Amino acid sequence: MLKIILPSLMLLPLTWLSSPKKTWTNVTSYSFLISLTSLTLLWQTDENYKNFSNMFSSDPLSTPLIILTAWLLPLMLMASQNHLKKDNNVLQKLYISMLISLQILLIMTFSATELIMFYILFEATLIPTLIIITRWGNQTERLNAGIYFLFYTLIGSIPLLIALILIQNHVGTLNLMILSFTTHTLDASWSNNLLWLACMMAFLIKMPLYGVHLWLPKAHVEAPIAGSMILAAILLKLGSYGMIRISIILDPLTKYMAYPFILLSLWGMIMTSSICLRQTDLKSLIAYSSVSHMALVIASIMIQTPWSFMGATMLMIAHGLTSSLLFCLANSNYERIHSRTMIMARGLQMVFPLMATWWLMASLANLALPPSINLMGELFITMSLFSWSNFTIILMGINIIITGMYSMYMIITTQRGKLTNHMINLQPSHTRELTLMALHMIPLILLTTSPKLITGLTM
Amino acid sequence: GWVRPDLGQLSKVTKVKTDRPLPENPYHSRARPEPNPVIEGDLKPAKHGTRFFFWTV
Numbered sequence: 475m476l477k478i479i480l481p482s483l484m485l486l487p488l489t490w491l492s493s494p495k496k497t498w499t500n501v502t503s504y505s506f507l508i509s510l511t512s513l514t515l516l517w518q519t520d521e522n523y524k525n526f527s528n529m530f531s532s533d534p535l536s537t538p539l540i541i542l543t544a545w546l547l548p549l550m551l552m553a554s555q556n557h558l559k560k561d562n563n564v565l566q567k568l569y570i571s572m573l574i575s576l577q578i579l580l581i582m583t584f585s586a587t588e589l590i591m592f593y594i595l596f597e598a599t600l601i602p603t604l605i606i607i608t609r610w611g612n613q614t615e616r617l618n619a620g621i622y623f624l625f626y627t628l629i630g631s632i633p634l635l636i637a638l639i640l641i642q643n644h645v646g647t648l649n650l651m652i653l654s655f656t657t658h659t660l661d662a663s664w665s666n667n668l669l670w671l672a673c674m675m676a677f678l679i680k681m682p683l684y685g686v687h688l689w690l691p692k693a694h695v696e697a698p699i700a701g702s703m704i705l706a707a708i709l710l711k712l713g714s715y716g717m718i719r720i721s722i723i724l725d726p727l728t729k730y731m732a733y734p735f736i737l738l739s740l741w742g743m744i745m746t747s748s749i750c751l752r753q754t755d756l757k758s759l760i761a762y763s764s765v766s767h768m769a770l771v772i773a774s775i776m777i778q779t780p781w782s783f784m785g786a787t788m789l790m791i792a793h794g795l796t797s798s799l800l801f802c803l804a805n806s807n808y809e810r811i812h813s814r815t816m817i818m819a820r821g822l823q824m825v826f827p828l829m830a831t832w833w834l835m836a837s838l839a840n841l842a843l844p845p846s847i848n849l850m851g852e853l854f855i856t857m858s859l860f861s862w863s864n865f866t867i868i869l870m871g872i873n874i875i876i877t878g879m880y881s882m883y884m885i886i887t888t889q890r891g892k893l894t895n896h897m898i899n900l901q902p903s904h905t906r907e908l909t910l911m912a913l914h915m916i917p918l919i920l921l922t923t924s925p926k927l928i929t930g931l932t933m
Numbered sequence: 934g935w936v937r938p939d940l941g942q943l944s945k946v947t948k949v950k951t952d953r954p955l956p957e958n959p960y961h962s963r964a965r966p967e968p969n970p971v972i973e974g975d976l977k978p979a980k981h982g983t984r985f986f987f988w989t990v
């Protein structure tokens with residue numbers, strides 16, 4: 475893991491020592507090489523786990539998240555290097571440093587073998603995205619969004635720290651494999667119920683669970699494009715990864731303690747899909763779609779079925795890719811028309827045909843068109859939920875119907891229809907942003923071609 | 934035949950011979966409690982480093 479961590483660390487001196495006319499080129503190229511290096515974690519020819527060191531290890535669950543982070547860093551640089559052209563050189567290098575630090579800390583968080591180090595890197599990732607949102611956001615409400623994000627996460631994560639220290643005192647090491655082997659069954663008392671809630675509520679906050687999801691739409695709206703990408707594509711999945719890692723020592727009382735959160739997830743995905751149906755802001759629509767998909771992931775992890783875990787992993791990877799792609803397309807329209815209003819730009823299919831093709835493919839990925847990994851994850855989550863209870867199919871079907879409805883509504887109101895001819899400032903297309911859309915869509919196609927990479931721990 | 938002592942003679946410490954035995958425990962002291970069993974041995978290094986959470990050394 476050190477062979478990925480060290481050159482990502484060396485990206486920062488490269489950023490601060492490169493010429494201002496060469497910084498973007500050098501950092502983008504070497505981050506692409508970093509991702510190519512990170513692809514060596516897929517060499518898993520055995521049932522064992524690649525425990526590289528005493529503090530770093532690789533997993534069938536951790537590996538796709540690490541590869542996705544390393545792949546998202548150059549895409550974030552390409553996405554963010556347009557709204558920083560009228561910007562100071564040291565501020566540009568600081569922004570690149572923030573993105574690189576996010577990538578480093580997220581790779582270390584996913585490769586961590588010890589839960590206290592996982593929590594330390596959790597908060598370490600909490601810092602620079604707050605800095606990015608607050609400093610390079612556009613509207614006034616970025617400060618309130620950053621406060622909401624930071625303190626939802628902190629109030630979640632403090633009882634997680636208390637619970638981790640308690641489990642460390644009880645067991646001795648807080649090492650993941652040691653806990654997985656010497657797991658003890660809890661006796662289902664009120665203290666154990668509170669311990670369960672303490673170690674689950676941080677991840678449920680960052681997922682986000684319904685009712686506590688209020689930080690996410692304003693944070694994603696007010697964030698810059700790279701911040702929205704890293705948030706919606708890695709940090710929610712970081713919460714899910716924490717849930718999967720910590721759920722192994724919570725038997726058996728997760729069986730009955732999972733009940734309120736499954737109901738919250740299902741009804742919240744219905745409610746947030748309805749909000750997407752009636753939402754006037756494109757980034758808000760994408761954010762609430764992310765809330766619904768992560769609610770599906772929450773329900774799968776709560777029901778703790780091998781099909782549910784596999785569908786959760788596939789939906790994590792697929793939703794990260796398609797949500798970053800949707801945010802990049804919305805940011806292209808935002809850099810064109812300087813607005814986020816859903817209905818303001820309408821006939822963009824006429825002027826931007828290839829970008830309309832990218833929009834259509836992103837939305838078809840969003841509504842889980844087969845045989846994509848989006849549909850793979852959603853279908854296996856549905857199968858596991860129907861095994862858990864046959865009446866969940868009603869909520870699943872309503873969610874699927876509204877999902878297709880808001881995705882096609884987005885397509886029709888942003889691309890189809892008559893062209894808003896007053897928008898004289900419609901530059902044709904940037905090869906940079908078309909490349910960004912291609913670099914989002916192609917890994918979706920390749921993972922659709924070979925879905926065995928992102929199945930996860932259970933299969 | 935008595936001679937008055939000079940200046941400084943009555944005020945000095947004199948030895949004296951007696952057959953009365955010296956009291957071995959004049960304070961009537963109880964038995965003193967034993968000290969702690971001090972640990973001896975070579976100072977080996979710390980096992981597996983500091984063992985502070987996830988720190989290897």
Ligand SMILES: CCCCCCCCCCCCCCCCCC(=O)OC[C@H](COP(=O)([O-])OCC[N+](C)(C)C)OC(=O)CCCCCCCCCCCCCCCCC
Nearest residue numbers: 629630633634636637640665666668669671672675676679
């Ligand atoms: C994001 C949500 C935040 C709020 C909810 C957080 C989780 C709620 C449920 C857990 C209780 C609170 C966290 C406790 C962390 C430690 C848990 C633990 O170790 O449990 C076992 C321990 C018990 O210790 P034990 O396990 O050693 O028990 C000994 C048992 N025998 C003797 C049988 C062996 O539980 C506690 O000590 C819990 C005491 C909590 C007292 C303080 C609560 C303050 C308020 C909490 C919420 C504050 C933030 C929100 C404010 C409002 C915002 C709108």
